[PDB]
Every structure is written in C-alpha cells, then in structure tokens.
Amino acid sequence: DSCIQFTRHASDVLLNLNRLRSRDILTDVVIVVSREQFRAHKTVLMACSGLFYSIFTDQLKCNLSVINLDPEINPEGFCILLDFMYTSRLNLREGNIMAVMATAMYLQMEHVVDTCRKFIKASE
Amino acid sequence: DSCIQFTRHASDVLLNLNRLRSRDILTDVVIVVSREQFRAHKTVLMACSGLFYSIFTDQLKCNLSVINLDPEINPEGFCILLDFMYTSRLNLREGNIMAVMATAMYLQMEHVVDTCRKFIKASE
C-alpha cells in the first residue's frame, strides 16, 4: 500500500498497556505462581507467550479468571518475564538467569530463551 | 536499572494483537459508526485514543459491550484509524484526509491530527 508509519506507535501502545497494568485497569486474569498472584491482561500475555496463547484460545480456559502455573515455576522469574512482556526490558542477572530461562522455556518466549542461552554460554 | 531490551518486542506484540483482532479472538467491544460495526479490544483502543481511554475508565461505561460513536463520524475514517491503532500504518490519501483528521480529532489521537495538519498545509 501507500501507508505512512508512526515509528514510536508500537512502543507508545505498550507503555500505555503497562500504565493500565500498574493502575489495575481492565486486567482480566490473575496468574498464580507458588501462591504469588499477578494481575494482567489476557491479550498481552497471549501476544508474548506461546503458553498463554494456547491457554486463552482454548474454548474452556479462555473464560477462566485464575490460571495456576506449574509449582516448579519461580515467582521472581515470572515477575521479571511479566515486566519484560509489558516493557521490552529484561532484568537479567547472574542470580536470576537460571530461573528466568526455565520460566521463559515453560512460557514459550523464544527470544528470551535465546538471550539466556547466549549469556550462559559466555560465562562458561 | 541494568536491563537489556529486545528492540522488536513492542512491534511483535502489536502484530500479535492485530492477529487476534483479525481472528476475532478475545475482542470485548463493538464500536458502532453510522450502522457499521467494528470489533476491537478495549485495552488497545484505550492505549491509542484519549476518547476511548476516558470511556473505558468510566465506572459505568467500562462494562458496556457496545459503544455508539457520534453520527457525524465517517465509518471509513474510523476503519483507517482502527487499522493504524493495530499496525502503526496510516492509509492517508487526498480522498480521505479530511474524514481521517476529523475522526482523529474526535478520538483524541494527537500524532495522527499532527500529520494530517502538516499534509493539508503542504497542499495549500
């Protein structure tokens, strides 16, 4: 087509979605991790994760307001990944890289899994 | 902080939100324009428009599944703007610029209003 494009549009949309998350506006699901609860928007979770995409496209699960993750999932690893989903920023540190990579593998967040694999390989 | 950032994350999220819109997945509102109906996600509309932000933060309106726009609003102008919200691409043409700018002013989409004003000024 002959469209023009606003370069900062996608980033501004994500920034606004994160502001709604902060203020708990229109959040429609609670993700439960080892008794730690995280409120979020189903569509953002689906847009970022192959696991949430599969969960919320399921005819029965799409209607759930609570999702319980596998007990092996670390709440801090999940929190870091939830923050990444809403900001594009990943708080990756020596002390959390193993939990973050394991959580990203479970959530099916391929780009995060890739950078964790590379950062781990650099330290060996 | 000491975060790393995935450059294409915001764009990939918006692309996935547009794929959900195409497949009518988790859309939670119908926008009615001169008897033309558009299905969308309330959070994306809020993230892009000052008008939808005000509508869906209202305690009564946040719960509506149908929103009727002012009858002076042109459905094609709205369609072009809805496409922009989900893609960052604006199909701006000599034949639609007046309807697009009027719709962007009503929806409170300041960056769109700005480029329409500039494109109109160039033709005078």
Partner: peptide, 4 residues
Amino acid sequence: WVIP
C-alpha cells in the same frame, strides 16, 4: 512519521 516515515515511509515504511
């Protein structure tokens, strides 16, 4: 704004 840019030409994509």
